[PDB]
Amino acid sequence: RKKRPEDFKFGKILGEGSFSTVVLARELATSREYAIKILEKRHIIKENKVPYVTRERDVMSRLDHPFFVKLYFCFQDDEKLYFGLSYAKNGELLKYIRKIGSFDETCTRFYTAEIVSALEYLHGKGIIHRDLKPENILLNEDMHIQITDFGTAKVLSPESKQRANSFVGTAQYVSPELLTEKSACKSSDLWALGCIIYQLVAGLPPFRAGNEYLIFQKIIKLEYDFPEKFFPKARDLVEKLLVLDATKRLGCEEMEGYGPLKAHPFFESVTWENLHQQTPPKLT
Numbered sequence: 666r667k668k669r670p671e672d673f674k675f676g677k678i679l680g681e682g683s684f685s686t687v688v689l690a691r692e693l694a695t696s697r698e699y700a701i702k703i704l705e706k707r708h709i710i711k712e713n714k715v716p717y718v719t720r721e722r723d724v725m726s727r728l729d730h731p732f733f734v735k736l737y738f739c740f741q742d743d744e745k746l747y748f749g750l751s752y753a754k755n756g757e758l759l760k761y762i763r764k765i766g767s768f769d770e771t772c773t774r775f776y777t778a779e780i781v782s783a784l785e786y787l788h789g790k791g792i793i794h795r796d797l798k799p800e801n802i803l804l805n806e807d808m809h810i811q812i813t814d815f816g817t818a819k820v821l822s823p824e825s826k827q828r829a830n831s832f833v834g835t836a837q838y839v840s841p842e843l844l845t846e847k848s849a850c851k852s853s854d855l856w857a858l859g860c861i862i863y864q865l866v867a868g869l870p871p872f873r874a875g876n877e878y879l880i881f882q883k884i885i886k887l888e889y890d891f892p893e894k895f896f897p898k899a900r901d902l903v904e905k906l907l908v909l910d911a912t913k914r915l916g917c918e919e920m921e922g923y924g925p926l927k928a929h930p931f932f933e934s935v936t937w938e939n940l941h942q943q944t945p946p947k948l949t
């Protein structure tokens with residue numbers, strides 16, 4: 666049959682959006698924990714964004730991978746919509762970056778590789794995330810990544826692939842092409858990847874300033890710098906991702922795809938087929 670709010674005990678808030686919350690929920694019957702995404706219909710109705718919410722729901726129902734959140738169930742209330750998602754016990758990657766300052770090389774390689782492997786799967790389904798960043802990369806009980814927040818995700822097509830883009834994600838991770846021509850492709854997610862790797866090694870994202878206009882100006886100029894203490898092979902990797910021309914980013918279709926990305930020297934040691942079974946290095 667169907668589930669109702671009364672079937673659950675609602676605990677701590679795991680996430681806070683403007684129009685939404687994610688709450689830790691225990692299903693009383695089974696005692697299984699879920700992260701439940703709760704949407705107020707009022708806001709969705711009022712902004713005429715129903716098609717967008719269904720899009721999120723559908724995109725998520727296509728995900729069956731260890732590195733991605735899973736949609737288990739959906740039910741409905743008088744004033745609220747509920748999505749039951751996998752619960753990532755250890756919270757946001759950002760929390761760990763903040764706690765230890767920056768990742769050592771072992772940890773950088775390991776988590777970058779999970780992210781790259783996650784992206785190859787996602788993109789292989791014609792799906793782009795569009796808001797990739799450390800706060801949307803969670804860690805599960807086993808400290809593997811769980812990529813989440815599919816509210817901005819889009820299914821791509823070859824006609825789509827190339828100037829209508831509706832959504833501009835978080836300023837620090839946005840690619841130049843989203844800003845200037847309102848294009849959004851797989852490559853734009855690869856730009857975000859480069860920002861994230863840089864952030865893991867350096868402790869903070871590459872493009873930084875006192876407001877979003879100033880951050881955008883740095884992005885479109887490619888105005889950023891590596892600190893002296895930056896793993897050389899990660900720097901080469903980052904330099905091959907943070908490239909203004911979207912068709913020249915390591916990993917995009919035009920650069921012969923994921924093969925060359927996974928074959929970058931920073932990933933020499935990585936065994937790509939068994940990642941989700943490896944015990945992750947301790948974060949220190």
Ligand SMILES: *SCCNC(=O)c1c(C)oc2ccccc12
Nearest residue numbers: 706709715718719739740741746
């Ligand atoms: S829980 C069944 C999945 N339902 C929806 O996604 C849904 C329906 C039928 O009506 C909606 C209105 C607003 C948001 C989501 C909605």
Ligand SMILES: [Cl-]
Nearest residue numbers: 936937938939
């Ligand atoms: Cl392998």
